[PDB]
């Protein structure tokens, strides 16, 4: 039934992205709030997040769950662990793809956080969340009773309605965990099943090579001197400004 709505999103992956206010200082969070749309009524908002919803870590349909990128590994968490608040706790209505339909009150910023193991990942952005009351009586909370009036609300509907955003081949993510010291030289060790692009400034001669097996550069002595790029692009990504562009 709903599996046809995910066939495009199954080809994507979550990604890490910059967030101005994490738990401590600005960081590279797994949940980065790219957009906060609140042009509807009754306080309903549609967030767009670097993490994905509705499908598990392996790409399968798994309902009320998030998959997010943690340093190259797609990790998974039930959606009920997730919390978010603008000026008072919001409520997660549904999540699909990169997008999250929630119910929020007014606020000058929106914060989204969840706890995994002992680390609390949070990301707060200054995008204003509006509460637009329908009609001529400016309520801060919908009434218990009244009359039905015309309104526009972010529907709890994931079907295709003609609005699209773009998929793009991800840029190569640099990773310093791939590079270490051994034999008093720089050794780069790509993750198995993937490839790394290694660019070292050593011996006055730039060396740029692509490797899938451990390599030791005899001409390099300090691991700061060389960069290793996680050359994995099988799964596509939204062209967020927080990621580098592929060639």
């Amino acid at each position, epitope marked *: 039934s709903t599996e046809e709505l995910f066939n495009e999103y199954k080809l994507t992956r979550p990604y890490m992205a910059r967030c101005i206010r994490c738990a401590v200082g600005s960081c590279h969070s797994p949940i980065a709030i790219e957009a906060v749309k609140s042009d509807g009524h009754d306080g309903y908002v549609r967030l767009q997040t670097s993490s994905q919803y509705g499908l598990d870590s392996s790409g399968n349909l798994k309902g009320r769950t998030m998959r997010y990128d943690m340093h190259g590994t797609i990790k998974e968490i039930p959606l009920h662990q997730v919390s978010l608040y603008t000026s008072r706790p919001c409520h997660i209505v549904d999540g699909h793809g990169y997008f999250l339909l929630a119910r929020c009150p007014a606020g000058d910023s929106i914060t989204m956080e969840f706890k995994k193991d002992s680390v609390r990942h949070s990301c707060s952005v200054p995008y204003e969340v509006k509460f637009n009351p329908v009609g001529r009586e400016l309520y801060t909370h919908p009434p218990e009773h009244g009359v039905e009036q015309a309104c526009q609300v972010y529907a709890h509907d994931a079907q295709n309605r003609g609005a699209y955003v773009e998929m793009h081949l991800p840029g190569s993510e640099v990773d310093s965990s791939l590079v270490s010291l051994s034999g008093s030289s720089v*050794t780069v060790t790509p993750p198995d*099943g993937t490839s790394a692009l290694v660019e070292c400034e050593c011996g006055g001669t730039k060396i740029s090579e692509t490797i899938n*097996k451990t390599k030791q550069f005899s001409q390099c002595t300090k691991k700061e001197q060389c960069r290793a790029y996680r050359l994995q692009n099988d799964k596509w990504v939204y062209n967020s400004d927080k990621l580098p562009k592929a060639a």
Partner: antibody
Amino acid sequence: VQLVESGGGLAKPGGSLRLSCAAAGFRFSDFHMHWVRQAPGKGLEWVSRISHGGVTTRFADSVKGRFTISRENAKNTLYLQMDNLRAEDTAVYYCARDSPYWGDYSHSLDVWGRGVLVTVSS
Amino acid sequence: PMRLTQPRSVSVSPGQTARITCGGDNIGSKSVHWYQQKPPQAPVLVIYDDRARPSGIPERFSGSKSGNTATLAISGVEAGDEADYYCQVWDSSSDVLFGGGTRLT
């Protein structure tokens, strides 16, 4: 840097055995590992290799489809499940480590284990 | 698909220069490694690329290749050279392959 093997000896035709290889002196999780056998009086013969994550494994034609390789990185050990023995498998078996400094893709071997005798006979 | 062929046994005089050959199909492009191996002891690689030695091994050894043949050259033959030697090649077909051990004497 050391590779120390164990588990071989004497076994029966058509049976099962195990060879284990423990590594020290380097970060084992990054390097490919190899098993290479040598019969008495004859030269080296490649048995198999594993690709430092368990994602890829390769075996030779003369031992195709029979034997198994695994590696536990956290415990730092390499297992060759020595199944479906034959008489002419009798040989020494060396655990070896893939070498860096490879230039073009070539699979050099840097450090070799002592070698474990394996005998298959009634 | 590729077989590495070496002379089975070699006779040399101490103090001179000696060579052990290794040949095979498509051997010129593929790397030809060279290993020193006493029959009971563990192998130790003497040449890890077509050209270069690993750290710690004596300088008197040097590989070579031309066309579709390769060589291991020993300068100043020593009793320490009195052991078997092997040429290794890797390919996407069959992965690692060693040749017939050249018994030096």
